[PDB]
């Protein structure tokens, strides 16, 4: 009875503190910045071979190797320049929802509704790809996994918790609690010190890996958050939700900066990604196409409309010379 | 091109051949989703994710039992959904109706038919014959309900259980008829804990669904 009033007073204090710093907006300082203009992109490669909807995709560090996952139960490694396949990895379960590529190029990870994260070894003397370890301990389904090094991995699940794992021993070292809904997407900072998690409670939190404590909590969305991206400089968020709205958050002003929306968009958002310079913001939609946004102006620069179904995957290479998309029509496309 | 690129092309061709070979076997199995609340008797209708397999008339089936707002999206390619309701608990029928409404009007299931099982008929008959609990205590509209003249009760059944069964079936069906515009159909069924013919009903309903899809594909409907 007494703690609710204290919590409300603290929330009001935080709200008053945030309002005091709103001395300017992006829409006002950017009046002296020229628009990016019209951007045209065309299909350069088409990747065929999948027989089911594609759910996950991730780029390598060499800008040539690509890994994709689909509901047919197989994991395929692609060579983007020649379209040749390198590996084909059978899965123990066909309900896969995420995939990842190790920064050293030696390991690949995947998971899904089986509540287990599996790590594969791509470089063996026998020539075959083999399973190295299965990570168990979650109670809900696994939605995303990201590598920190060859021995640490961060996972997010639908049981409102996040975890940091030790691959050598298979034990959970840190548990992140505080969410009230299923956790959808993760984004790892370039400095490998902080990560961001979105959830179905229409909120986003910033976590400290080294201590396991939540630092800041952001609100504003009206529905579930499906994708989160990280600005290259480490000080901004990019989030999407099912209410057809994209938002930009700052970690130093502790409030929202810009809203990306349009009256003709009434569908959900599935993926968000950035360019190298951060000027372009890419987003996937359920309208069977992908839009190109101006991060500093909230305008529309172009559109990619080569898919016949929902777009579920989106990524940009480390050198910035290609953009890859995935859809439920079992096709992958490389744009330039 | 170099010889190594030709060898890589040969490896890619073999990988493509192996991918193509595997796809043929996958398409010969029909997939079903099983949903229901506790005490409904889901595990006995055909007796992270639990799986079961059965075969009727040389046709293989694969049924999945998960454990709903998020993981339902990946089951939009299944042939049919199986829903089991306990018809011998008046206190919890409104929850079943709300769940059926929430599943029927889901935007990702707009093209998937539902097979509805109304289970535990013997307990309902015993409770109706005993007269220690009345439907009118929870459903006021039942006092004005009359058995339709086109009813086909099983021989020997007292004309007091047919009224209750048809009332429950009507209450479940009326939700299905309010929306859909013909894109999917509901198939009500009455079953019990001891019935074994349940396997044939799924086969017949799936054959009917595939027939409907084939009729629609040929510009006949």
């Amino acid at each position, epitope marked *: 009875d007494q703690l609710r009033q204290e919590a409300e007073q603290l929330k009001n204090q935080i709200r008053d503190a945030r309002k005091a710093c709103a001395d300017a907006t992006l829409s006002q300082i950017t009046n002296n910045i020229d628009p990016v203009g019209r951007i045209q992109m065309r299909t350069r490669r088409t990747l065929r071979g999948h027989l089911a909807k594609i759910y996950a995709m991730h780029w390598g560090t060499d800008s040539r190797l690509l890994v994709s996952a689909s509901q047919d139960g197989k994991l395929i490694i692609w060579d983007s320049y020649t379209t040749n396949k390198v590996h084909a990895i059978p899965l123990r379960s066909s309900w896969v929802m995420t995939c990842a590529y190790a920064p050293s190029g030696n390991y690949v990870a995947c998971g899904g509704l089986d509540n287990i994260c599996s790590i594969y070894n791509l470089k063996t003397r*026998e020539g075959n790809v083999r399973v190295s370890r299965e990570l168990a301990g979650h109670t809900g389904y696994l939605s995303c996994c990201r590598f920190l090094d060859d021995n640490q991995i961060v996972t997010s699940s639908g049981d409102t918790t996040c975890a940091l794992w030790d691959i050598e021993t298979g034990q959970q070292t840190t548990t992140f609690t505080g969410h009230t809904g299923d956790v959808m997407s993760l984004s790892l900072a370039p400095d490998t010190r902080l990560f961001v998690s979105g959830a179905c409670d229409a909120s986003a939190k910033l976590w400290d890996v080294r201590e396991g404590m939540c630092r800041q909590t952001f609100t504003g969305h009206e529905s579930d958050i499906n994708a989160i991206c990280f600005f290259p400089n480490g000080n901004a968020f990019a989030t999407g939700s099912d209410d057809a709205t994209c938002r930009l958050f700052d970690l130093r002003a502790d409030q929202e900066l810009m809203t990306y929306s349009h009256d003709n968009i009434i569908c959900g958002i599935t993926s968000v990604s950035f360019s190298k310079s951060g000027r372009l913001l890419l987003a996937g939609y359920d309208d069977f196409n992908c839009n190109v946004w101006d991060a500093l102006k909230a305008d529309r620069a172009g559109v990619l409309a080569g898919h016949d179904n929902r777009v579920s995957c989106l990524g940009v290479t480390d050198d910035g010379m290609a953009v890859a998309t995935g859809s439920w029509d079992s096709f992958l496309k490389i744009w330039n | 091109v170099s010889a*190594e690129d030709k*060898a890589a092309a040969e490896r890619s061709k073999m990988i493509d051949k192996n991918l193509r070979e595997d796809g043929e076997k996958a398409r010969r199995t029909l997939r079903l989703l099983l949903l229901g609340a506790d005490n409904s008797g889901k595990s006995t209708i055909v007796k992270g994710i639990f799986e079961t397999k059965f075969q009727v008339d040389k046709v293989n089936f694969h049924m999945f039992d998960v454990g709903r707002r998020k993981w339902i999206q990946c089951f939009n390619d299944v042939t049919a959904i199986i829903f089991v309701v306990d018809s011998s608990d008046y206190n919890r029928l409104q929850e079943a109706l709300n769940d059926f409404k929430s599943i029927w009007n889901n935007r990702w299931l707009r093209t998937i038919s539902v097979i509805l099982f109304l289970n535990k008929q013997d307990l309902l008959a015993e409770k109706v014959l005993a007269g220690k609990s009345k439907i009118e205590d929870y459903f006021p509209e039942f006092a004005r309900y009359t058995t339709p003249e086109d009813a086909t009760p099983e021989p020997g059944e007292d004309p007091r259980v047919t009224r209750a069964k048809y009332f429950i079936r009507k209450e479940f069906v009326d939700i299905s008829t309010a929306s859909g515009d013909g894109r999917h159909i509901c198939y009500p069924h009455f079953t019990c804990a001891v019935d074994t013919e349940n396997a044939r009903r799924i086969f017949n309903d799936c054959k009917d669904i595939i027939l409907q899809m084939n009729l629609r594909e040929y510009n006949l409907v």
Partner: single-chain antibody
Amino acid sequence: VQLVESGGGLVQPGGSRKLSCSASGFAFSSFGMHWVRQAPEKGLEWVAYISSGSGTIYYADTVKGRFTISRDDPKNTLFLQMTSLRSEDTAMYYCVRSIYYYGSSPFDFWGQGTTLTVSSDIVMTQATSSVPVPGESVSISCRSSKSLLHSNGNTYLYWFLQRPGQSPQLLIYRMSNLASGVPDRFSGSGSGTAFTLTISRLEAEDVGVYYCMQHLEYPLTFGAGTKLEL
């Protein structure tokens, strides 16, 4: 990972004999296979190659019409059929494992070998018979008749080391890639038709003959060999 060869013996001119190789410890069906022949005073010579899927087969210009190579995946065995043997065929035969994809190492493992006793090409040139020489730096050079640099950015030069009584071991592939299991004392560089091999610090195990090989076009060619005497 183990390869064992069998067969061999003494034959008369005009006869025939069949060789076999038993593979174990790896996925034999995913690898391509080569046969390499070495004479007492001639060096290494390429004989034949068979793809993993039995798709393509190549033969040397001195063995066409007389040698036949076959594969048996279910038994993990190789066969080489030889007919109308001549006096020039008396030499050691080795079996080599190969796999080709982006980033692979196509000449990583060599067998032990068996002995058989009877009774346009790119020229790879080395010229030194013996380099007298622990702790010192040694440089070995190779020269090719035609440029080994392809338009795709890859240059196909390979280095091998043969210790006394041991099979050849891979050191460097594609001129800058250090093979697994090799200490970091070895390095290599070059451009066009000139290449060099560098050893930072010699030990007692760095004694042997070093060979150069190109992989641009068939047939494959080897160098004369440079012997390092400590």
